[PDB]
Write a protein that binds this ligand. Structure first.
Ligand SMILES: Nc1ncnc2c1ncn2[C@@H]1O[C@H](COP(=O)(O)OP(=O)(O)OP(=O)(O)O)[C@@H](O)[C@H]1O
Ligand SMILES: Nc1ncnc2c1ncn2[C@@H]1O[C@H](COP(=O)(O)OP(=O)(O)OP(=O)(O)O)[C@@H](O)[C@H]1O
Lengths: 289, 58, 98
């Protein structure tokens, strides 16, 4: 199509802004200390510089803190998670992370298309743009960044036919086996499922099955600073956005982009969740298709 | 730099909170607190400017 | 918020200078003096082979206070200029620090 062709014809360079900040951690940093630096700097992840390997080895993301919190839990040492001071290096090594899931990165010169496949194929959410000449991570590419850029084009240019069809027509998003919790569900349970399923967020639903909120991986680690608690109880320590299958692709995209969220919970007439539409979903359908 | 053998110009930039104000390519840093050093520095790739921070331990 | 440029020493410039030449020789850098308030310093990179380079410029900020300044020069790449910079500056400062 047209969107696919756009993406095969634009360089990642193109959506790097004119000014940009990039926070990097040396993997010899203390996980704990890093966590604060993420927070103080108001970022959700960071590139990892490994001084000994002389290289960028990967990302420090919220899942990694989750994987570690879990280990403590599996060990009945959850009480300690808050207090520990092992290095990022150490824990990544525990998991043989550098050897097993090595850094995925891209050139400023690669296509935006390429970056979209990249993130999806490798099932990752962050993608370092690294200048092959200098070896410098220029900037990190997210689905939201990629989509937002594409949306500018979308609006300043005639839409295709299908941009008017509906989620239901299009069959875009996830509608089978939605991982959700219940108002009552024990935070520790969410942990379990976050680790096991590799989804980012969980819809919190009532008995009837209507979405009342959403629990994220962040929420979990944020807390750990008891775990048998009610998901609902935990939430008192702090966005849910809905959409329907009757709604047009175009209408969805606008909301996802304008709204700033990372996905929509699809919902029938009585708010009974029916599925989820995410950024990968959108960006896979426009672009990889 | 090839050898290993041995009125300081006045300085007007000194501490910060636009780019020339920061001086492109010059090392900046924070008060080293709690055994961790933070370096910063802004560089150009073609038309773009990335200001990189490195969080490093001692 | 409190971002300081370079590093601030109060020792005497010639002294300062020597301290750096000493550090560098310890850190095993080679330099080219451009003058008693500027040196071009370089560091071989053993894993890589390639070199990293940077500029030292001494300033006066007060009358009893000085300022030493660091400036950079020129499938993952082996070689990461910005990181190798930071590392070169760090090693020195640490060496100097004590
Ligand atoms: N470019 C990359 N190369 C290699 N591994 C990566 C990369 N980006 C993320 N990871 C790893 O993938 C796992 C999932 O992180 P990812 O960013 O995909 O989801 P997340 O934990 O929800 O983070 P985010 O807030 O970015 O979504 C983590 O273990 C992370 O370290
Ligand atoms: N709670 C959930 N249960 C089941 N599937 C989900 C859930 N949340 C998302 N998904 C589906 O899993 C895939 C990954 O969704 P997720 O939101 O983690 O990734 P993404 O949207 O591509 O990343 P980002 O959130 O950064 O856009 C998507 O195809 C989505 O439809």
């Amino acid at each position: 199509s047209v969107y696919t062709t756009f993406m095969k014809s634009h360089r990642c360079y193109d959506l790097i802004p004119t000014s940009s900040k990039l926070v990097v951690f040396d993997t010899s940093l203390q996980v704990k200390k890093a966590f604060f630096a993420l927070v103080t700097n108001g970022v959700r992840a960071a590139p990892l510089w490994d001084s000994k390997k002389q290289s960028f080895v990967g990302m420090l993301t919220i899942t990694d803190f989750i994987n570690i919190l879990h280990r403590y839990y599996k060990s009945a040492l959850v009480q300690i998670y808050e207090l520990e001071e092992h290095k990022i290096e150490t824990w990544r090594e525990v998991y043989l992370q550098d050897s097993f899931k090595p850094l995925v990165c891209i050139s400023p010169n690669a296509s935006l298309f390429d970056a979209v496949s990249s993130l999806i194929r490798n099932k990752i959410h962050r993608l370092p743009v690294i200048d092959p000449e200098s070896g410098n991570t220029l900037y990190i590419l997210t689905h939201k960044r990629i989509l937002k850029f594409l949306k500018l084009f979308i609006t300043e240019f005639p839409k295709p036919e299908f941009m008017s069809k509906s989620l239901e027509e299009l069959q875009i998003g996830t509608y089978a086996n939605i991982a959700m919790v219940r108002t009552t569900t024990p935070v520790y349970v969410a942990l379990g499922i976050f680790v096991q399923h590799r989804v980012s967020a969980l819809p919190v639903v009532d008995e009837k099955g209507r979405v009342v909120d959403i629990y994220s991986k962040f929420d979990v680690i944020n807390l750990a600073a008891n775990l048998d608690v009610s998901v609902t109880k935990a939430l008192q320590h702090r966005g849910v956005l809905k959409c329907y299958l009757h709604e047009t692709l175009e209408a969805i995209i606008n909301r996802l982009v304008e709204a700033e969220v990372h996905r929509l919970v699809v919902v029938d007439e009585h708010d009974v969740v029916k599925g989820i539409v995410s950024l990968s979903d959108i960006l896979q359908a426009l672009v990889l298709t | 730099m090839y050898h290993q053998e041995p009125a300081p110009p006045i300085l007007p930039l000194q501490v910060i909170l636009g780019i020339s104000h920061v001086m492109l390519n010059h090392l900046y840093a924070l008060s080293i607190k709690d055994g961790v050093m933070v370096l910063s520095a802004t560089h150009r790739y073609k038309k773009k400017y990335v200001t990189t921070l490195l969080y490093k331990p001692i | 918020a409190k971002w300081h440029l370079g590093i601030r020493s109060q020792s005497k410039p010639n002294d300062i200078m020597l301290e750096v030449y000493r550090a560098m020789k310890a850190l095993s850098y080679e330099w080219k003096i451009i003058n008693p308030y500027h040196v071009r310093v370089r560091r071989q990179n053993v894993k890589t082979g390639k070199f990293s380079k940077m500029s030292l410029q001494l300033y006066q900020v007060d009358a009893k206070s000085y300022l030493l300044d660091f400036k950079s020069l020129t499938l993952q790449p082996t070689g990461h200029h910005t990181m190798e910079f930071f590392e070169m500056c760090a090693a020195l400062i640490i060496q100097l620090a004590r």
